[model samples]
Target: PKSMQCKVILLDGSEYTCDVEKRSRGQVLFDKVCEHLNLLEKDYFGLTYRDAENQKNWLDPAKEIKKQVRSGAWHFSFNVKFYPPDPAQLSEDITRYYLCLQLRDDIVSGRLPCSFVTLALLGSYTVQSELGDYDPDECGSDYISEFRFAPNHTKELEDKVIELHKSHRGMTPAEAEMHFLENAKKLSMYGVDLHHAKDSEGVEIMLGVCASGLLIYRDRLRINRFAWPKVLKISYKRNNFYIKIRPGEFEQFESTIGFKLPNHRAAKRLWKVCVEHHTFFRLL
Candidate 1:
């Protein structure tokens, strides 16, 4: 809500009254911001939790739980950001200042997610991870960096867990991952076409590849049974590659599907490809 203001102007030797504040001015500005958010979503960049909460000062709880498995205490965090001016304002400088403050408040109070914060501080295409901290000046553009998260886990451990999925399913972990990668590559090469007036059937096929690939992995994991957590890394560079799986080292889980998983390298490759290509990867 905004208060009204009256202004006096002298024209043709006569004084005239005018209302300085207009009702729709702020509305227009907010609409533009929402539009921007929509575009970001289309780019596979979903709003994350960090954008919503304000970083708070670290407090050493007297009985902080050391183990993440049983930690009950949550910590606060912080970061400063900026945004463009609001369009409904008369002055650009004033609009920028007011809207920035307003957006910050709206975000914190409403729990709007880090997507809002990223848009304000960093522009689209940029992502934040619990991996590290960020320096605005170094970013060269609006984007989040220096991501970190709670219950820190090692990369090696994650790879091992994913590998376990391969063994329990009867295929080497590398082979299971390859099936994922192949599907992903095909989707990337030919994108989804969701239009009836278009010659593009690529889109639907791409989507199916994405969906089917995931179902296979989930089912395969259930087939092989292991007791420890497993993790695997999938990436695309110089063709697809998979880290060799060491049989005895990784934790395994029961596989719900029959005792046959796809090729390790191919499954890993296709799965990673689909995840990166799909918009829902943000859920990860």
Candidate 2:
């Protein structure tokens, strides 16, 4: 089969040119790009492009290249998709470096909504990667001034970065990066896009799904959880979402819980999230 030339572009405007088999899968092309860049933590990133509907989607690894790539315009972006990616998948220094950069970009773009403290901590970790140990006399406010992504809290951010630097005085850049990702992954909301809904009582709640399971949050507190194994089925109706939970060995019967969203659209959105999460984390 003839080979097709394509351009793999990074989020930072960096580009790589490569040729792939016409019938190759998206995973093959992604591997080629990662090999060219000598990147680690391959699972943390994915190649993405906008479909005919102008909605962004990841290139399906099982699908053929021709299905996703435009015949005339063969270009795609390499971007971070799964936040707080599996730490076991990252194995090298360069991978952590790029992951940190991705995290920084997510913060700047507001894609990763976080508290001020979380933002400060992430900013400090980025600084630790760029610069070594922090010295009060040598490192001034100007050290973190370039990170103007958040204007209102720049000073507070700088201070926090400096403080974090002091605590990480003896760590190497790679160590700091690893520590940052480890801590970031432990956050309850990491990699989660929360949807708002109300329970039967009309009390507000946040519904989200992740690799672990279905999450129910009352404000910031994760009040309850339904692990994948415990969940028997999930479904939705006009404006209600339902989750059927399996009963314990000693329990008499299974139970179903329902939540009411503002409208059918919201309910469907929540259902879709649950389906995707279950498919990826449980089935796959």
Candidate 3:
């Protein structure tokens, strides 16, 4: 009687429901989804819920389910929290499929802006995955009218996509997905999650924490890159986030760079994200 039902929107926009004991932790529910999908590489995905501030956070798997959300309709989104550097690095075909779904959602939401050509190409792969071998006679341009790839979507874009789809006639859904990922990962904004902050020199900028490492972006362009091997440590103090860069050929000692985030909350949040990303990608 104390059990509660959790509704999670999966990466493919499918609904998953599981009822768990009130005292059970988030891990219990998470395991249900994994078992349901037969997903083996589970670390990359997590359940996200909106807190009081409307900010998303990974459900604390160690905490009781009842303690996290008390409402009746407990809803959460299942997402890939860490984007792998290469989809080829993924061992399972199903895992890559999930990543592809998430990337499509990113583009559709306009979070990952793409060039015109890139847009059409990516849109084609998805069309290939969903519709299979271009059926020129089955339906006309109206076939793709239902897909909204990005903010500036139009019929003109779908035409380019159709032409590309013709080239992928022999590709299996999985093979087309491989092609999709190869190109998608090359986008400048692929897996980068930007955090608003200013550099140590008081220059306003955006800091990116991703699979590769820490990136400094100004006016949406990458200005500096510190790969994981070069990052000695990462920490946050008050409203400032700091990164210790391992000494390079030009420098004798490690250099610690500071960033002033919007506030303490922002600072702490960025630190955790950086920590989580680094560990998952680099740690043995």
Candidate 4:
């Protein structure tokens, strides 16, 4: 093919198709996709892909498309790579709508687990955003069934949504989205990406990265956390992902921690994710 065919699965699960030069930079395709949405707050968004090992990777804006999509699949997902701490601060209603879509995906994919009540609440707010005030004639009993907000969805959940949606008599679309964000952001898995790995003790653990910092998860629970301010440096050597930590209140010496990755590239990718998240969330 003279040009590369790219498919971007947007937040709403809609496919965005574009053709670009074979040697195009990730930035080129990214900007083109953002232009489609007319998004100005481009810093929080990015293009991403996942490898065979299930480790998520961001398409490096500085690199050529051919160089990064080493699998040659040429398919990318348009995602909220950097989740905002306070979504209300975002400038555009379209941006917030996309954020809602992203969180919607999170719940549907089982990445962000929520209680039944929480699910119903989130779903009801979404209904308000999409359908506005409840009109008995306009909204049927099964209206909530049209939206797939959770996996293994049931009538129990749908009835709950309808019940909740009826109470939101005069909420605006943007207001509904804000209510969704305020609640969704409270989830433990809200903005985290889990990377499969093992600690130095040969114990199976997940090295998770998010806006706050790096997290160590065992049994799907946070075993430890190294906040961004506590992370001194991150690097990878061979198959080892390393972290240098600052001293504690009573300590004078620094310490380093390491984890075993599948290979050198996996280690390198984890390091990059940590560094980027740290910069994006904690820096000016």
Candidate 5:
């Protein structure tokens, strides 16, 4: 395959050409970027820094912003298992089970600020076949599924989310919704102007027990849950945000597993991470 090349023009009308080799485009770019940065080094690259402290101080604000928003001190862990019946019931009784005990452990042990636990499930059918090859007649192998729980211990987590929703206490959900929407509209305007009219596009926002923990945001919303088990589905309907859950399936898991699934109350931690840190996005 031939390599690709293109030039990107900056706002100042300066342009940089990026020619990428098909086999090693990423490696080439990475090496060039490193070399460029290395040129800033005083010892290795012959660069001089007379006022090192002043230059360091000048760059502190940007560092602070990145640390505050990008770096998080939260941890989470959970498990997902698949159970099937009939001839398809293979030896993998525990098809998938992963635990993230470090979420709370990290917070309590001073390893993280707060953490959220997510549990997800997916069937075999969800697997992707490569290179035009397809397989049929595969039962329970079609989709990937998952769920998350945070603030895992009790309702205290949910209460915390509700508390953050208001500047002052005692605001109802409707009140909170209005207040949130007003600010969201203002934010939308700013984003539209900055992004050259992105507001008119149908932006997708998610809400549920995952990200906001009974709170609301310009992007998504979360609510407190105090049930046996719960999970939410993300959907977009005419640009209205919708989060659906399989409450019945949740109950079934609790009944058969003999352990309390991540209860809704515990989901607050996950919601907090979502709103504050975009915990899931970090995975990607």
Candidate 6:
């Protein structure tokens, strides 16, 4: 099989080179890139490129390489997608590292909004991956000083790092990365990108679809949940989305719960999420 040379640039601007079969799948090239980097959590990152039209696209592992790119030399970027990715799909320590990288970016960009406590805790996890065990002597060093946290949250972040380090006394870097991902994945808004909506009672709520199921959050609290099994059907109207549930015999409320979105676009977005989540979790 004919092979092509490719260069992959990491987020830190580090570059790696590899050769891929011209007729191979995009995933083949991606796997090779991950292998070269000794990346633990490969699934958390993907190779991205721009088409002739300058439109950004991710290399689909299922697609033929020749069909997606030319057969000679090519350049690609290894990047983390901004949306909350499913950790269940990730199986490596490096994958979680990249996930944390994206999370840190989100926090720095003000996209992932949270309180100082949450920021401090999350920042501490990232710091642990970079600097191993925390040392009191290095507390005033550039490593800790360079670590970023929300305003006035530096001390709390530093303290959290020390506390967490005490808990993570003898873990390797890879193990620490995996531990961070495992804990971070359980957060209420972990993989969530909240969508604004209102329940039937006109009470404002946030809806997010994750690997688990449909999540309903009132403010920061996850007030209710609808697992895929309980969800009989999901549909949307002009500006409303309805989730039809399979209620139990003892239930007295309506089987169908309705929510009003901001507009038809918002409703459709929610409907799509429901369909995608249900299909992913239930359809096998």
Off by over 4 Å in 6: 1-89, 105-121, 133-138, 141-144, 150-152, 166-170, 219-222, 250-254
- How does each model score on lDDT? 0.26, 0.73, 0.85, 0.87, 0.24, 0.69
Rate residue 177 of model 5 by lDDT. 31
lDDT of 4 by residue, 153-209 (tens): 988898888889999989999999999999998898888988889889988899889
User: Candidate 1: where is the Cα deviation over 4 Å?
Assistant: 1-229, 243-284
Model 2 agreement with the true structure over 1-284: per-residue lDDT tens digits: 79988887875568888998888899998998888778866866788776554545567677997877554366788876555447645567887677666666656766566777777777666667667777677677666546543425666677877777677776788888887777667665667656778988899998877777888888665578899789988999999999999988999888998999877756776776577667666643
- Listed per model in order, the count of residue pairs whose N, CA or C atoms clash below 3 Å is 67, 0, 0, 0, 25, 4
Best by TM-score: 4
Task: Give the alpha carbon lDDT tens digit for every residue of 146-208 in model 6.
Answer: 766554446556666666666665677776666656656655566555688999999998887
Q: Model 5 over residues 141-165: C-alpha lDDT tens digits?
A: 2321121123233444333322232
> Model 3, stretches more than 4 Å misplaced?
65-73, 141-144, 220-222, 250-252
Candidate 3 positional error at 54, Å: 0.9
Q: Mind giving the per-residue lDDT tens digits that candidate 3 earns over 1-284?
A: 58877899988788998899878899999999888888898888888887666666677678876777655347889988888877898899999989998899989888788998998899889888888888799658675647777778777888888888888887788988898899999998888888889988888998988899999988655489999889989999999999999986888899889999978878988998899888888863
- Using lDDT as the measure, name the better of candidate 4 and candidate 6: 4
Which candidate's lDDT is highest? 4
Q: What TM-score would each prediction reach against the true structure?
A: 0.16, 0.69, 0.90, 0.93, 0.19, 0.61
Winner on lDDT (2 vs 3): 3
Candidate 4 contains a number of clashing pairs equal to: 0
Cα miss at 79, model 4 (Å)? 0.4
Candidate 1: 10-residue stretch with minimal lDDT: 193-202
Q: Whose TM-score is higher: candidate 2's or candidate 6's?
A: 2
What TM-score would you give candidate 6 relative to the actual structure? 0.61
Please give the TM-score that candidate 1 achieves against the real structure.
0.16
